[PDB]
Amino acid sequence: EVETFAFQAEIAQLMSLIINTFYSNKEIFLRELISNSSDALDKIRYESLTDPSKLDSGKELHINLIPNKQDRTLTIVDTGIGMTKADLINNLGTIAKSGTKAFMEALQAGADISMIGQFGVGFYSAYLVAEKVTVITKHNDDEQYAWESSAGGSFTVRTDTGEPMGRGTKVILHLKEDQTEYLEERRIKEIVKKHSQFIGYPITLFVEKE
Ligand SMILES: COc1c(C)cnc(Cn2cc(C#CCC(C)(C)O)c3c(Cl)nc(N)nc32)c1C
């Protein structure tokens, strides 16, 4: 079964701002998602120092970038710590409230959208380029879940029945029709080299069969 939830009011306002503001420097979404993956890998690495069994669900710590021109999706996969159901439904929205309000204040004061990551809400920059985001995630302590939202004020959570993941997070960006440049190899490489050169995990860009 699928459960449908309302976003916290401030996050709903932030998403509406990101979708309807004219902002041409959209490539920053990819930096923010890679940064999130790097942080998630740090966290499971740290936990495994005192309990190595935490890596039973997968010892490789990496980030994969998978463009798909046929479905018009860009998928960012990491083998980091992942998210529990309580993270997806309550915790991430609750902790984001303060930074969201701070970010919207700064924006009016003079900040621009590229500072979004400094307020801890970089994930939502995905909606600069995507009309829908699907997040598949598996934490050691919980089941595999699929989160989805097309904005519009709500999100869904279901237990995922697709292929098991072991551990980590898969962010699937369903790209807007006019944002297909982020499916091009040359463009993804340009962005990673510019914004992400000092990430401490291997980033593999998959090539498309064509
Ligand atoms: C469900 O969609 C999201 C929403 C609504 C908000 N933010 C994020 C960003 N985000 C957050 C991650 C986390 C966590 C909990 C801990 C304690 C690990 O920080 C987290 C984690 Cl663990 N991994 C990744 N790749 N992204 C994460 C996402 C993916």
Swiss-Prot record:
Result for mutant: residue 32 to A: Strong ATP-binding. Strong interaction with HSF1, HIF1A, ERBB2, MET, KEAP1 and RHOBTB2. No effect on interaction with TSC1
PTM notes: ISGylated.
Modified residues (N6-acetyllysine): 43, 69
Region of interest (Interaction with NR3C1), residue spans: 1-210
Top-level taxon of the source organism: Eukaryota
Subcellular location: Nucleus; Cytoplasm; Melanosome; Cell membrane
Self-association and partners: Homodimer. Identified in NR3C1/GCR steroid receptor-chaperone complexes formed at least by NR3C1, HSP90AA1 and a variety of proteins containing TPR repeats such as FKBP4, FKBP5, PPID, PPP5C or STIP1. Forms a complex containing HSP90AA1, TSC1 and TSC2; TSC1 is required to recruit TCS2 to the complex. The closed form interacts (via the middle domain and TPR repeat-binding motif) with co-chaperone TSC1 (via C-terminus). Interacts with TOM34. Interacts with TERT; the interaction, together with PTGES3, is required for correct assembly and stabilization of the TERT holoenzyme complex. (Microbial infection) Interacts with herpes simplex virus 1 protein US11; this interaction inhibits TBK1-induced interferon production.
Domain remarks: The TPR repeat-binding motif mediates interaction with TPR repeat-containing proteins like the co-chaperone STUB1.
Family indicated by similarity: Belongs to the heat shock protein 90 family.
Function: Molecular chaperone that promotes the maturation, structural maintenance and proper regulation of specific target proteins involved for instance in cell cycle control and signal transduction. Undergoes a functional cycle that is linked to its ATPase activity which is essential for its chaperone activity. This cycle probably induces conformational changes in the client proteins, thereby causing their activation. Interacts dynamically with various co-chaperones that modulate its substrate recognition, ATPase cycle and chaperone function. (Microbial infection) Seems to interfere with N.meningitidis NadA-mediated invasion of human cells. Decreasing HSP90 levels increases adhesion and entry of E.coli expressing NadA into human Chang cells; increasing its levels leads to decreased adhesion and invasion.
Descriptive protein name: Heat shock protein HSP 90-alpha
Lineage of the organism: Eukaryota, Metazoa, Chordata, Craniata, Vertebrata
Protein's gene: HSP90AA1
Parent-record interval covered: 16 to 225 of 732
